[PDB]
Design an enzyme around this catalytic site. Structure first.
Site, short mmCIF file in Angstrom:
data_model
loop_
_atom_site.label_atom_id
_atom_site.label_comp_id
_atom_site.label_asym_id
_atom_site.label_seq_id
_atom_site.Cartn_x
_atom_site.Cartn_y
_atom_site.Cartn_z
N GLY A 1 68.82 71.16 104.22
CA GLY A 1 70.06 70.62 104.77
C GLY A 1 70.38 71.14 106.15
N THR B 1 59.66 70.89 96.46
CA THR B 1 60.48 71.91 95.83
C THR B 1 61.88 71.44 95.52
OG1 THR B 1 61.13 72.83 97.97
CG2 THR B 1 59.18 73.77 96.92
N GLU C 1 52.94 66.54 130.36
CA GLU C 1 51.77 65.67 130.30
C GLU C 1 51.74 64.88 129.00
OE1 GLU C 1 49.22 65.29 132.57
OE2 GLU C 1 50.00 66.71 134.06
N1 LIG Z 1 55.37 75.22 106.23
C1 LIG Z 1 56.35 75.96 105.71
N2 LIG Z 1 57.41 75.33 105.09
C2 LIG Z 1 58.41 76.07 104.56
C3 LIG Z 1 58.39 77.45 104.63
N3 LIG Z 1 59.51 77.91 104.03
C4 LIG Z 1 60.23 76.86 103.58
N4 LIG Z 1 59.55 75.72 103.89
C5 LIG Z 1 59.96 74.33 103.63
O1 LIG Z 1 61.35 74.16 103.79
C6 LIG Z 1 61.79 73.17 102.89
C7 LIG Z 1 63.26 73.37 102.52
O2 LIG Z 1 63.99 73.82 103.64
P1 LIG Z 1 64.27 75.37 103.98
O3 LIG Z 1 63.91 75.67 105.41
O4 LIG Z 1 63.56 76.28 103.01
O5 LIG Z 1 65.85 75.43 103.75
P2 LIG Z 1 66.77 74.81 104.90
O6 LIG Z 1 65.99 73.81 105.72
O7 LIG Z 1 67.34 75.88 105.79
O8 LIG Z 1 67.95 74.11 104.07
P3 LIG Z 1 68.90 74.97 103.09
O9 LIG Z 1 68.18 75.45 101.84
O10 LIG Z 1 70.05 74.09 102.70
O11 LIG Z 1 69.39 76.14 103.89
C8 LIG Z 1 60.87 73.27 101.69
O12 LIG Z 1 60.53 71.98 101.25
C9 LIG Z 1 59.63 73.95 102.20
O13 LIG Z 1 58.56 73.04 102.19
C10 LIG Z 1 57.33 78.08 105.25
O14 LIG Z 1 57.32 79.31 105.32
N5 LIG Z 1 56.31 77.33 105.80
#
Ligand SMILES: Nc1nc2c(ncn2[C@@H]2O[C@H](COP(=O)(O)OP(=O)(O)OP(=O)(O)O)[C@@H](O)[C@H]2O)c(=O)[nH]1
Ligand SMILES: Nc1nc2c(ncn2[C@@H]2O[C@H](COP(=O)(O)OP(=O)(O)O)[C@@H](O)[C@H]2O)c(=O)[nH]1
EC number: 3.6.5.-
Lengths: 427, 170, 50, 426
Positions: A134, A169, A244
């Protein structure tokens, strides 16, 4: 010349933790911030011998930010840069875009302004976000809206994490991805996709790591960014800048979605028994077993491709290698484009960080291409988003925040219109 | 084409002699730069800062300073037969205007008589020196004749052949 | 309190809006006229030299 | 005496010129610190064509570096013979074109070329009797193509009665670095047909095959290609710097080689070019020089003249040689291969001799042939340009910056009439 990097969300600032780790270990700076001129693109110098990164970590939940405040790099980051909210958007695009976003993005803006003012020859911004959440989705799109009205002409490199087709997830992430792309479409100038299942398969097969956590994922993402900014940081035989890619890769102002890949991702043992040269890494950058987005360019047609080369690489063989690719017939380019490549060679090899699982390789290739296989992923998202929307599942949370039914239908038909747009350029 | 010119000279000589005396304002044979401004005022045109000095300079070529009736016929004849000479014509125009004047405001259709005498030319060529049309007349003065003649001479002079040359195709 | 905060920001935004610079646009216009005058002045002088 | 200022644009132009000033300074005996250390009087008497004595044996090159990125300029002053250029001659922007010809010709050009022209104007009035100007640039890049293009147009409007050379590499489908190469090539050439006095067509394919087969190099970095190009450029101007039995200035070659005013794109070669395994096994004679000179593979452009006919050809020889061998060799190579030469011009080859070889060699040559085969390149890029333009791909950075649709249509039309008039005159 300078470029600043902003990180939004849990996945965003975790990616930054690997990037700035890689950066100081490359330019020989200890985590406290002092050397024992090419660092000027990313670090500003206090004048007392202390170097501070050009970055702002921001999110809505204080947990992931405050382990950073107390890790090894407590003293590298300026305190004001590490913005943090009080409560999370909780996988709710509307909550991050209208309820809680409206209080936090204005603080981020009046921060990012003085980062740009400290800069002189600002090349652009580059943003990190995962659309499944979110925070990264909601206020990310809100931040991009206000960035476009502020600067406009400056590049905004969006390195986004799209939700994987099967491995996921969250459960409301189809809603979040469609509504976010609706604004990521007309704001980001150059948006690179980074899936999660593809990186999972790379670490499983190439790195032969059978139990990977998020650390290794973020590690190799930083490697691609390092390979992409080496042309800006260091001098090579044939360099490109960040302006570029704006021209050379996106034929139409709405088709900006690139498939990234990197080679060679090789463990510590294969390198000892294997040979590195320019021709084989030029090959390995194109096979779908090394792509970062679950799609197959074999199903699509290329518009234009880009090729970063690092290390001991001469220009004669990059030309000969790209020639061999064009004469092959497994992949084909669009009829309108007779020439479809943008090549680049830089002198400095990729450095290694202790504790990482990347070997010390003599040479590497970072490929960034544009195709039409990207149209299949967007369509694949529409099937399962529309699947649940008709019965109005989970709509009550977003509409209770202050949205309505109108924006779902109008955002839905906009991305649906994009589907038709991709199909007509491919013909 | 000689007959037009010879007959024209046979008649204009008497007009020319009085034209000379009339341009003179001191009742002498010498035409001073002072007189030229008075003439232009009669025509109703104004000289520029250095125009008169150039006008007196270019015509006279057997002595320096004021002009004399002898220089004046020499100028007249040379300019008249000048056609492919690329030669000066600054003071020829004012005198030809005065001689071709009999209305004391300028002349209208008589341009064609001037034109035919110089060459048969064309109706389109007439649309070059001025904008007069066959049916319509106009009002004219000194201002609109000298400027257009002077500009035309500058326009012809400019054009020359460098990479503007054109050869028959292969 | 929040209404007053918002109102100040609107007044700031209205102040910032770019406004036409009359004392400078006319200068540009006058400069171009003198430039064009000198071009025509130049062609007569070149004619004189030939 | 007669003076030529040097103008280098973009990354390709800057690196080409850096090796050029190194090779030239070695010919005249100036060390990297900028002082004279030669022995013969023949070296000191003709350094006014390319240098100016500053104070106490300080000879500075008469060159102007111009581009849009700081990396190239820093790479010049880092390497040797980098400390010889006057720092005021580093006219220099900061933002960059990004391989966008409009940004190099309408957006960023408007704020740099005025500054470039001040330095160029100062270098023209610093000398007495200009022979011409010398511009090294590319045709596929943005800051070399657009920036150098507008510079050429403005210069021809200021000094029109002076010669002008443009050493330009052109893009080809096999060596394709940028994606918008055709958009840059066809518009750039559209300006060269009406501005440049004569242009020298170069391309990277020929450079790669020269270093593959003739030179037999294993790792041909860009330093060697620039080394090859510099030898050709030094050859075209040796007549001004050294006396000989048959001198030929720039004006003498252009007026003699260009039969029609728009047909001034040349193909170049250089002799001798030999590998280290065969530098011992060869002789040095005029006929041995001539066949390796007129060889098809030895052309420094990837346009085979044996697909067409020669209109005119020129030879610049350097070293103590006998003029009879010069004239009889040109006559024999024209009599056996009689069909390859145009018919309505007898003696299609002009030749000249200079008595000073390049340092380290006994006898060299330089070939400048104006053939009719060059239309292949114009079609090879024209169809790619039309293929892209008929769907408006990559157009919004062009039309959004100031170009309209008629400019590309003008480019095609001028492209098409030039290949048609090449076809007529052949
Ligand atoms: N490639 C990668 N994706 C990640 C990683 N950690 C979380 N994600 C992705 O982030 C998605 C969910 O968003 P998050 O960044 O964890 O949480 P957010 O975007 O801050 O949203 P909120 O939970 O509401 O705070 C998941 O579907 C994961 O696939 C990471 O270390 N590497
Ligand atoms: N000979 C030579 N050619 C070069 C070199 N560097 C780049 N090029 C050529 O330049 C073209 C790309 O042009 P670019 O360097 O971007 O031009 P610029 O941006 O205007 O300076 C390619 O086709 C290369 O073949 C060099 O060091 N030597």
């Amino acid at each position: 010349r300078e470029v600043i990097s902003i990180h939004i969300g849990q996945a965003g600032i975790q990616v930054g933790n690997a990037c700035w780790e890689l950066y100081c270990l490359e330019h020989g700076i200890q985590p406290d911030g002092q050397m024992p001129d090419a660092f000027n693109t990313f670090f500003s110098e206090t004048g007392a011998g202390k170097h501070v990164p050009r970055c702002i970590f921001l999110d809505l939940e204080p947990t992931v930010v405050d382990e950073v405040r107390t890790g090894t790099y407590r003293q590298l980051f300026h305190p004001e840069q590490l913005i943090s909210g009080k409560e999370d958007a909780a996988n709710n695009f509307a909550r991050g875009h209208y309820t809680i976003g409206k209080e936090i993005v204005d603080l981020a803006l009046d921060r990012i302004r003085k980062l740009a003012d400290n800069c002189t020859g600002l090349q652009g911004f580059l943003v990190f976000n995962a659309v499944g959440g979110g925070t990264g989705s909601g206020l990310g799109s809100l931040l991009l809206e206000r960035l476009s009205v502020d600067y406009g002409k400056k590049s905004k490199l969006g390195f986004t994490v799209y939700p994987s087709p099967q491995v996921s997830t969250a459960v409301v992430e189809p809603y979040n991805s469609v509504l976010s792309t609706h604004s990521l479409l007309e704001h980001t100038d150059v948006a690179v996709m980074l899936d999660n299942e593809a990186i999972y398969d790379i670490c499983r097969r190439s790195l032969d790591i059978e139990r990977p956590t998020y650390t290794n994922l973020n590690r190799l993402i930083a490697q691609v960014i390092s390979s992409l900014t080496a042309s800006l940081r260091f001098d090579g035989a044939l360099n490109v800048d960040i302006t570029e890619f704006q021209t050379n890769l996106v034929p139409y102002p709405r088709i900006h979605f690139m498939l990234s890949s990197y080679a060679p991702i090789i463990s510590a043992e294969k390198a000892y028994h294997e040979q590195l040269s320019v021709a084989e890494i030029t090959n390995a950058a194109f096979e779908p077993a090394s792509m970062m987005v679950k799609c197959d360019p074999r199903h699509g047609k290329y518009m234009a491709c880009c090729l970063m080369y690092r290390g001991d690489v001469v220009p004669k063989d990059v030309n000969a290698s790209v020639a061999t690719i064009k004469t092959k017939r497994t992949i084909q380019f669009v009829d309108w484009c007779p020439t479809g490549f943008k090549c680049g060679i830089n002198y400095q090899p990729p450095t290694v960080v202790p504790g990482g699982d990347l070997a010390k390789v003599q040479r590497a290739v970072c490929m960034i291409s544009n195709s039409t296989a990207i149209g299949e992923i967007f369509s694949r998202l529409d099937h399962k988003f529309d699947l649940m929307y008709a019965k109005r599942a989970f709509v009550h949370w977003y509409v209770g925040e202050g949205m309505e039914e109108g924006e779902f239908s109008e955002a839905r038909e906009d991305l649906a219109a994009l589907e038709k747009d991709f199909e007509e350029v491919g013909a | 084409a000689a007959a037009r010119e010879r007959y024209a000279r046979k008649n204009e000589q008497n007009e020319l002699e009085r034209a000379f005396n009339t341009i003179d304002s001191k009742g002498d044979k010498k035409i001073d730069a002072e007189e030229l401004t008075e003439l232009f005022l009669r025509l109703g045109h104004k000289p520029k800062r250095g125009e008169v000095e150039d006008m007196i300079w270019e015509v006279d070529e057997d002595c320096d300073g004021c002009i004399s009736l002898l220089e004046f016929q020499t100028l007249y004849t040379r300019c008249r037969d000048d056609k492919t000479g690329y030669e000066p014509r600054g003071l020829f125009n004012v005198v030809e205007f005065v001689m071709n004047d009999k209305n004391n405001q300028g002349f209208i259709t008589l341009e064609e008589a001037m034109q035919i005498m110089y060459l048969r030319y064309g109706r389109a060529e007439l649309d070059m020196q001025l904008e007069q049309v066959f049916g319509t007349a106009d009002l004219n003065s000194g201002k609109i004749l000298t400027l257009t003649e002077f500009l035309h001479c500058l326009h012809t002079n400019q054009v020359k052949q460098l990479l503007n040359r054109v050869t028959a195709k292969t | 309190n929040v209404l007053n905060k918002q109102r100040d920001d609107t007044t700031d935004a209205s102040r910032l809006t770019p406004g036409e610079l009359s004392e400078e646009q006319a200068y540009i216009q006058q400069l171009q006229d003198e430039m064009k005058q000198i071009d025509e002045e130049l062609v007569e002088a070149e004619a004189k030299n030939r | 005496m007669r003076e030529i200022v040097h103008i280098q644009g973009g990354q390709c132009g800057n690196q080409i010129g850096a090796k050029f000033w190194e090779v030239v300074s070695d010919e005249h005996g100036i060390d990297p610190t900028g002082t004279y250390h030669g022995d013969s009087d023949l070296q000191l008497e003709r350094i006014n064509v390319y240098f100016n004595e500053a104070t106490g044996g300080r000879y500075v090159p008469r060159a102007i570096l111009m581009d849009l990125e700081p990396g190239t300029m820093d790479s010049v002053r880092s390497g040797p013979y980098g400390q010889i250029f006057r720092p005021d001659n580093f006219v220099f922007g900061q933002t960059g074109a990004g391989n966008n010809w409009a940004k190099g010709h309408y957006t960023e050009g408007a704020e740099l070329i005025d500054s470039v022209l001040d330095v160029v104007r100062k270098e023209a009035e610093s000398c007495d009797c200009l022979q011409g100007f010398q511009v090294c640039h590319s045709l596929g890049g943005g800051t070399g193509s657009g920036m150098g293009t507008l510079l050429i147009s403005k210069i021809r409007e200021e000094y029109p009665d002076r010669m002008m050379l443009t050493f330009s590499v052109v893009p080809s489908p096999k060596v394709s670095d940028t994606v918008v190469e055709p958009y840059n090539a066809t518009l750039s050439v559209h300006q060269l047909v009406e501005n440049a006095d004569e242009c020298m067509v170069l391309d990277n394919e020929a450079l790669y095959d020269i270093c593959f087969r003739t030179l037999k190099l294993t790792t041909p970095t860009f330093g060697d290609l620039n080394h090859l190009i510099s030898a050709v450029m030094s050859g075209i101007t040796c007549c001004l710097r050294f006396p000989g039995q048959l001198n030929a200035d720039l004006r003498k070659l252009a007026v003699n080689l260009i039969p029609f005013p728009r047909l001034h794109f040349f193909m170049v070669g250089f002799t001798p070019l030999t590998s280290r395994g065969s530098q011992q096994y060869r002789a040095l004679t005029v006929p041995e020089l001539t066949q390796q000179m007129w060889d098809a593979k030895n052309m420094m452009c990837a346009a085979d003249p044996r697909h067409g006919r020669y209109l005119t050809a020129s030879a610049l020889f350097r070293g103590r040689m006998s003029t009879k061998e010069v004239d009889e060799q040109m006559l024999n190579v024209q009599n056996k291969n009689s069909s390859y030469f145009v018919e309505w011009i007898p003696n299609n080859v002009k030749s000249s001799v200079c008595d000073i070889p390049p340092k380290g060699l006994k006898m060299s040559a330089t070939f400048i042939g104006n053939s009719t085969a060059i239309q292949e390149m114009f079609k090879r890029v024209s169809e790619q340009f039309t293929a892209m333009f008929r769907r408006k791909a990559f157009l919004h950075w062009y039309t959004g910056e100031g170009m309209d649709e008629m400019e590309f249509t003008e480019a095609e039309s001028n492209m098409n009439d030039l290949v048609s008039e090449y076809q007529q005159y052949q």
